Amino acid sequence: MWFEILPGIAVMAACLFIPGMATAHIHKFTNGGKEKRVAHFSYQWNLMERDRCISGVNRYHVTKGLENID
Amino acid sequence: AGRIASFLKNAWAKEPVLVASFAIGGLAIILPSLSPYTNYAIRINRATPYNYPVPLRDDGNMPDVPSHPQDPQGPSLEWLKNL
């Protein structure tokens, strides 16, 4: 009758489930649908800073293409 | 002859962990010299341009250095693509 254990870990699974999408969704929520732009090196940080400056809204994940330029 | 083989057998029985560790370790030093691909690993490491290849001031008589980044002459890493 091992299935009696099945509820026991099921909520446990749900307990470990929530940290999965919650971090995943909020990132997607915060960065304009895009996932978080990880800056593991100073070049990435410089790219993020230039994107933030170009956006004009102090939001790096806001991105504008050629329609923004002449 | 017989003594060496018997000692190896006893070690493989008495302390099997010791012989396994000593073996795999002894390989760990002698293969890299024997292996024919470590030079290719050196090529891998030299291939990656962590910094900018700052150009040279052109003055004539350097046929080796390409004039354009699309030029045919110059260093190539097609071996990297095949690898």
């Binding site: 009758m1 699974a13 470990l16 999965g20 971090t23 969704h25 593991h40 | 560790s21 293969l31």
Partner: protein, 318 residues
């Protein structure tokens, strides 16, 4: 909403630890022909709530022969380090992208000694003073093996960025390349969390409990929370480190499901091992790692550092 994400990290881990105290009592019992707790709610689902309420409203006895400062600080250290050591884990998008996440978490893993020692000495009992040194020696002597195993495994990953570890595995499970190593690593994990085969600190004949003797009610339950949070955290560490999974960036939920399933399987293996094996002896306990585990780990690390060079397959640094 950053703090909301933090809370969404802590609180679910707290429910996970809470219901681990039910799944262990059910799994063990079923492994030894016992139905387990199924009286408090449906299938014993409510049982962890009742024991938690009891331990919160149980009297916390102040050890008369003690300095209360460490008697209170040690649960703080043990619990807070255990939870903040979940911070840099590669969920499909890890909460904190620390460039040295694996080293970060390995360094914090050594801090449990800094709860064990104060608990064992401040409580001021023979069992406590014995078990403090014995458990300290256990965990410190296995931390080294954890370290070389981590280094040798990582030498094929590329860096200490723990988010790229998924990118390392992708095709094949990493255990397929380091099954001799993982077999040690997992066991050393079993040693560091003080589990029945390797616990040696409880020893309910000559140490009784070892460190959580005079701790009662709340501070006592805090060390259990730390202990059964390290179970989940290190099983998850092993799960990603060796039992890789798929992760499509457009569907983050897939890797989440695969990872939680791996963590549950590994925790069930923990309970599986403890429900069967006898308990080590301190003599054999340190004989297992000094005489046997450490030389094999050294040789395997040598093998796994020489291997990328000879195969011309050094992992990408960035």
């Amino acid at each position: 909403m950053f703090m909301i994400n933090i809370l969404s990290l802590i609180i679910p881990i707290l429910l996970a630890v809470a219901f681990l105290t039910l799944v262990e009592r059910k799994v063990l019992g079923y492994m030894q022909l016992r139905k387990g707790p199924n009286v408090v709610g449906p299938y014993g689902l409510l049982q962890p709530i009742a024991d938690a309420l009891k331990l919160v409203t149980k009297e916390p006895l102040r050890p008369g022969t003690s300095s209360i400062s460490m008697f209170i600080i040690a649960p703080i250290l043990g619990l807070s380090l255990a939870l903040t050591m979940w911070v840099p884990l590669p969920m499909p998008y890890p909460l904190i992208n620390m460039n040295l996440g694996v080293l970060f978490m390995l360094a914090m893993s050594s801090l449990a000694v800094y709860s064990i020692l104060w608990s064992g000495w401040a409580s001021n009992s023979k069992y406590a003073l014995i078990g403090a040194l014995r458990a300290v020696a256990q965990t410190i002597s296995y931390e080294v093996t954890l370290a070389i195993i981590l280094l040798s495994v990582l030498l094929m990953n590329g860096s200490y960025t723990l988010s790229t570890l998924i990118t390392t595995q992708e095709h094949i499970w990493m255990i397929f390349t380091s099954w001799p190593l993982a077999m040690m690593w997992f066991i050393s994990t079993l040693a560091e969390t003080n589990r029945a085969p390797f616990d040696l600190t409880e020893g309910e004949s000559e140490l009784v409990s070892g460190f959580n003797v005079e701790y009662a009610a709340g501070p006592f339950a805090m060390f259990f929370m730390a202990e059964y949070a390290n179970i989940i955290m290190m099983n998850a560490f092993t799960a990603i480190l060796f039992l890789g999974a798929s992760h499509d960036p457009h569907t983050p939920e897939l890797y989440t499901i695969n990872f939680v399933l791996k963590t549950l399987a590994l925790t069930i293996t923990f309970l599986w091992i403890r429900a069967s094996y006898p308990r080590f002896r301190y003599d054999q306990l340190m004989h297992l790692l000094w005489k046997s585990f450490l030389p094999l780990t050294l040789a395997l690390c040598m093998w796994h550092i020489s291997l990328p060079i000879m195969t011309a397959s050094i992992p990408p640094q960035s």
